[PDB]
Amino acid sequence: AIETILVINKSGGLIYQRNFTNDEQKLNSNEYLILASTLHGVFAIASQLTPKALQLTQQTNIENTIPYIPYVGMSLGSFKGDDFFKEPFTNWNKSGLRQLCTDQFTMFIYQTLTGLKFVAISSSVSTSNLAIQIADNFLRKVYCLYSDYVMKDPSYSMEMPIRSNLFDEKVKKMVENLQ
Amino acid sequence: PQYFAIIGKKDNPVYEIEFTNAENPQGFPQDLKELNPFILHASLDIVEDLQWQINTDNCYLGKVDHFYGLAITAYISYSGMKFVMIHGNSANSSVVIDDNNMRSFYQEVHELYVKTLMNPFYKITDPIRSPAFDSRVRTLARKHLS
Amino acid sequence: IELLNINQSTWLILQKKILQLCIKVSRKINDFEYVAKFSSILITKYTHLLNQSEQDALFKEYIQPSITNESITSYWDPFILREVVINRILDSDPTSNEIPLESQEVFNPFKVPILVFLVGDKAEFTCRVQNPFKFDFTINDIQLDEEISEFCEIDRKAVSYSGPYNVKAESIRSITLPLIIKKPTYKKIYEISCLKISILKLPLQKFDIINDSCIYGKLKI
Amino acid sequence: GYDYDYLFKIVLIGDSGVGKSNLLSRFTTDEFNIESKSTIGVEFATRTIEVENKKIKAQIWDTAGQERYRAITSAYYRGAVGALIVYDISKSSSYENCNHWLTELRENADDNVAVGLIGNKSDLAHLRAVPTDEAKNFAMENQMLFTETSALNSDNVDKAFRELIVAIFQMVSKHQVDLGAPKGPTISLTP
Amino acid sequence: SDGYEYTVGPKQAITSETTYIPSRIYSESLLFKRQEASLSAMAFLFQEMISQLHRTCKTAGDFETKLSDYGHNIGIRLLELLNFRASVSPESLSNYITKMRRRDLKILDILQFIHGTLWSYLFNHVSDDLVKSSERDNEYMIVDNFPTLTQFIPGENVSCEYFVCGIIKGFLFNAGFPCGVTAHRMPQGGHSQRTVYLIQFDRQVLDREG
Amino acid sequence: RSLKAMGEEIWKNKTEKINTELFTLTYGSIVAQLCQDYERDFNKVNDHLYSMGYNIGCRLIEDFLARTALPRCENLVKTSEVLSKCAFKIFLNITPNITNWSHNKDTFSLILDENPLADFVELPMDAMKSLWYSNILCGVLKGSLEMVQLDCDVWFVSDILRGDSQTEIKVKLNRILKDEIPIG
Numbered sequence A: 001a002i003e004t005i006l007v008i009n010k011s012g013g014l015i016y017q018r019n020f021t022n023d024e025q026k027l028n029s030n031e032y033l034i035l036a037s038t039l040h041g042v043f044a045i046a047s048q049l050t051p052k053a054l055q056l057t058q059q060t061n062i063e064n065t066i067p068y069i070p071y072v073g074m075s076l077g078s079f080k081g082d083d084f085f086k087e088p089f090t091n092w093n094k095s096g097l098r099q100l101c102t103d104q105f106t107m108f109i110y111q112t113l114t115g116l117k118f119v120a121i122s123s124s125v126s127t128s129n130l131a132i133q134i135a136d137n138f139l140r141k142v143y144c145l146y147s148d149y150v151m152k153d154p155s156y157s158m159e160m161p162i163r164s165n166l167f168d169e170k171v172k173k174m175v176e177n178l179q
Numbered sequence B: 001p002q003y004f005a006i007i008g009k010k011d012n013p014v015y016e017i018e019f020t021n022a023e024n025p026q027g028f029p030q031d032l033k034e035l036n037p038f039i040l041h042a043s044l045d046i047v048e049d050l051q052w053q054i055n056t057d058n059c060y061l062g063k064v065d066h067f068y069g070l071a072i073t074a075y076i077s078y079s080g081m082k083f084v085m086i087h088g089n090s091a092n093s094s095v096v097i098d099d100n101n102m103r104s105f106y107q108e109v110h111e112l113y114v115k116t117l118m119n120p121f122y123k124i125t126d127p128i129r130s131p132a133f134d135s136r137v138r139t140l141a142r143k144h145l146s
Numbered sequence C: 001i002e003l004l005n006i007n008q009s010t011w012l013i014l015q016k017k018i019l020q021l022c023i024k025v026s027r028k029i030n031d032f033e034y035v036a037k038f039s040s041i042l043i044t045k046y047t048h049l050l051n052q053s054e055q056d057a058l059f060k061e062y063i064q065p066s067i068t069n070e071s072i073t074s075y076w077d078p079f080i081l082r083e084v085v086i087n088r089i090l091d092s093d094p095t096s097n098e099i100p101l102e103s104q105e106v107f108n109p110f111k112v113p114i115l116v117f118l119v120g121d122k123a124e125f126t127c128r129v130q131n132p133f134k135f136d137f138t139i140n141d142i143q144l145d146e147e148i149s150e151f152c153e154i155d156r157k158a159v160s161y162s163g164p165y166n167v168k169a170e171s172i173r174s175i176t177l178p179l180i181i182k183k184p185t186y187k188k189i190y191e192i193s194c195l196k197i198s199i200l201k202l203p204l205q206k207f208d209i210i211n212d213s214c215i216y217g218k219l220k221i
Numbered sequence D: 001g002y003d004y005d006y007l008f009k010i011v012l013i014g015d016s017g018v019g020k021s022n023l024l025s026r027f028t029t030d031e032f033n034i035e036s037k038s039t040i041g042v043e044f045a046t047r048t049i050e051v052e053n054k055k056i057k058a059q060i061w062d063t064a065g066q067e068r069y070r071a072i073t074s075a076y077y078r079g080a081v082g083a084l085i086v087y088d089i090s091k092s093s094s095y096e097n098c099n100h101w102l103t104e105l106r107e108n109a110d111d112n113v114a115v116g117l118i119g120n121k122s123d124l125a126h127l128r129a130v131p132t133d134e135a136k137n138f139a140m141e142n143q144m145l146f147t148e149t150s151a152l153n154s155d156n157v158d159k160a161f162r163e164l165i166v167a168i169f170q171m172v173s174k175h176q177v178d179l180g181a182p183k184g185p186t187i188s189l190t191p
Numbered sequence E: 001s002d003g004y005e006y007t008v009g010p011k012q013a014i015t016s017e018t019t020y021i022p023s024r025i026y027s028e029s030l031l032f033k034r035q036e037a038s039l040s041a042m043a044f045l046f047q048e049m050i051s052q053l054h055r056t057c058k059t060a061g062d063f064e065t066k067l068s069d070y071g072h073n074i075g076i077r078l079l080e081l082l083n084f085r086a087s088v089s090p091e092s093l094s095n096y097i098t099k100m101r102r103r104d105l106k107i108l109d110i111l112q113f114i115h116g117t118l119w120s121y122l123f124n125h126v127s128d129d130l131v132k133s134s135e136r137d138n139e140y141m142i143v144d145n146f147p148t149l150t151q152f153i154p155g156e157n158v159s160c161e162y163f164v165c166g167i168i169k170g171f172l173f174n175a176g177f178p179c180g181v182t183a184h185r186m187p188q189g190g191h192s193q194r195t196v197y198l199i200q201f202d203r204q205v206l207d208r209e210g
Numbered sequence F: 001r002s003l004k005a006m007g008e009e010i011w012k013n014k015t016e017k018i019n020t021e022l023f024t025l026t027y028g029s030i031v032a033q034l035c036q037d038y039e040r041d042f043n044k045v046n047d048h049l050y051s052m053g054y055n056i057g058c059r060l061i062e063d064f065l066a067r068t069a070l071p072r073c074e075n076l077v078k079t080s081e082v083l084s085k086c087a088f089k090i091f092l093n094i095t096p097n098i099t100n101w102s103h104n105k106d107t108f109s110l111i112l113d114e115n116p117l118a119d120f121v122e123l124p125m126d127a128m129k130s131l132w133y134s135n136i137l138c139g140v141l142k143g144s145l146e147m148v149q150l151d152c153d154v155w156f157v158s159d160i161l162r163g164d165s166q167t168e169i170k171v172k173l174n175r176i177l178k179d180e181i182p183i184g
């Protein structure tokens, strides 16, 4: 039951805060900027905290591959078919903040190879690995929709705030099925 | 001999050429040389008149106009391009036009125009200044015209 | 001419042939008016279709008598004399003559020549005249303006002694003249592009300045 | 209130002990979390301004590193579009580090980044350890705006800040232009 | 050297006399070589061309005219060529044909042709519900439920779609049918990505038809 | 399968296709009007097309690498393999070849066997020695490989339209700038 999403372009700075809640509206718009930038900074600073046991010897390039959850999305745009993809894929942020679990919610993180970050706040609290496997697939559907409807846009400067209706209605359709 | 031309919607030529038969290779003697553009411009009016009518094929018009022994034939493509030509005697005859040779001649010349129209640098107003096009048209004339 | 669009159709060869027959018939009748008026059109519009033989023939036959009989009181193109450059010569050392000088914040970096003459230093006026036609004409004399007249003019006796300036068939031939000065200006920059010329013993007609392509190349003194 | 059209990241980079914490404390939208400088490396200030009808949001990140912050302090300039080099006219040591600071800034941050240079605490006229003339000459050699500030000498930093943003806008503003229906019954002509 | 050379006039060519040049375009046929590619490339070219016109223009009218002119250079080349393919009934292509598609010389025939063949070529599916408004005097219109080219363009306003408007404008203009074609947006049917290209013909054609 | 059958499957059934005569006619219209706008200054035409391609690529790198999500390339070999066999394969039906690896392994050449952009083209006679027609390809290549933090230079040395039989794209890696996000 994902309740909110938000995406950070390449160097901090919120660019999307469409909240998927019935009626909460507790948090001001301004403070989400500090939220997103603080998440970016914590992502950066957790990188230099790998314990020295695994710093010099990882030997774990078999778990980075992520399995294929069949129909996480629904039931298209540039993509076509029953689903955006069929094969499994690989993790890109292998030494960064992936999850922040909490009594009332859970924040999943999905980092694009170029540098984009996608953040999914979900009220639902899944052995803390199956949750990541659902979340990474779903956030990559969101990333595919982003590349479809924000990159192929004339009136959109690079790494700037997102202001569109196709994108927000499409991701709303994506999430209202995922519950 | 023969004198063939390709003309656009603004009533300017994008191509003109003249074919002999090697018996009298000077072509039309001296006066019809001056008179070819004006007789063809005259025939253009009848070609335009038949351009918009009902009545089967209607791209090939055949013998449309007459003059002092000159048979004037015309073919209309889709952009208003008019392929018009005049056939003259061999200095004495009652010259007649073939019904299929000139048909296929216009078919392939329209093929050439269609494929040389596509390139982005060619405008409708500018002429077809292409040695390859000229060579292809004249080797077609050798094969079909006579 | 009204049936065609001499002044919907762009058959230039056909238009040229009609204009040729028009001038020929106009000379066949004793009418020196439309012969001139159509020869001007023919050798201002369709100048890049007539070969050298026909251009020379037409100029010697139908335009030259139009010059002699005061039928045309102007020139054909306005595109003559592309370049109008001017300079001053330092005959002596540079020190001989010099130009007078005429006597808690915030900084931000994120944010043509004016010709000068003292009063009488010998100047140099070089103008490049372009002939587009296939025949060669001659310039009779040159004059400047009315607004900047009697200020920095070229010397009439100098041009007269220099004589008629022939210009070749297709050339961009240059003409260099001296230039006298007889008045100050204080502080009022004045433009120089009016530039009256006579061509083939015609009245002195104004000609503006046109660069390679339309942009008016103005310099000021 | 997502009415701002653009969001510009600017770093209030400067030497330790310069009084930059008091510098940005004047011009503020001070609310929410504070004292985050030691939490990771940064504290945040924001403002919305009107620039010929295009609302612009600013993000002042005040990076600081004492002895341990080596990699992330540089990584915070991943896409910084403005810089606000803070120095103090009280000691030559603070001004001596400006060359290194600019070198790191140009090496890491966005290519052709707008940089201003602010001298905090100019009220103190007893220990002027660097002249404004030399400071201006240094400012000339890099195409970078200069100013000096004080509590009593107010509005200088504010006008310099606004002029910095409107200077950046001219660089990273792609020109945007503000880009009888048939009503009645219908008849189908499809074959 | 042996070109047309329109200044000098028609050169004299002897029929009996023949050495062809490798043009590389006249030799290459144009039958129907299918080389279909991804929609992503078309969309990216579309948005970048819109952005470049967006910089170059100064007002909505300038953007209007510039994009219409850009699309006008595709209809000119489509009108001849698409009809020429349709003339083929199932090396020089002309030795596989006996007769052509006639001329679609009527208003209904040309508009039906754009409904059927042109759109099926462009977007791989026939357009829906061609209509004429029998209210003012004449207002033809072709409606699309989901325009492929401008699908990614957001905003309730419709001005970046005039590429197709220019395509139809050229297609009708070169066929002897001047027009004032213009697009409009109207949700009717639950789609809301529904766009009507209104074709408004000229008085010359209005007198010609009757 | 390393890349061949992978990219073949991706293009087979994951992509919404469209006719490419529309694509080439559109690009032809753009490059035709560019000449008229710039008054036949074909060097500036090439520069403008280079900017066009760079602006394409800066966005295009988010479509590819989301439609496939390949692992991060290491050094100049797997990157060339994907760039030849999958990157061009997804967006067009062309599989250009790789040739003349340099001695130091710092440069390579794409042979474009087919160029659907330049389908029906003859440059004017006065521009068959300056105008690189498909400069947008070099622009998008440079933009994409710069945005993957694999900064390099890309240019033409021969094209089918101008003379030589083979059509080339030389790609030389300048330096792998080590500012690729925190950990990727």
Ligand SMILES: *C(=O)CCCCCCCCCCCCCCC
Pocket: E041, E042, E044, E045, F056, F064, F070, F072, F073, F074, F078, F079, F082, F083, F087, F088, F091, F137, F140, F141, F144, F145, F148, F150
């Ligand atoms: C290893 O680091 C992976 C690098 C991936 C590079 C992707 C290259 C994309 C180029 C495709 C060009 C298609 C042409 C589109 C024209 C509109």
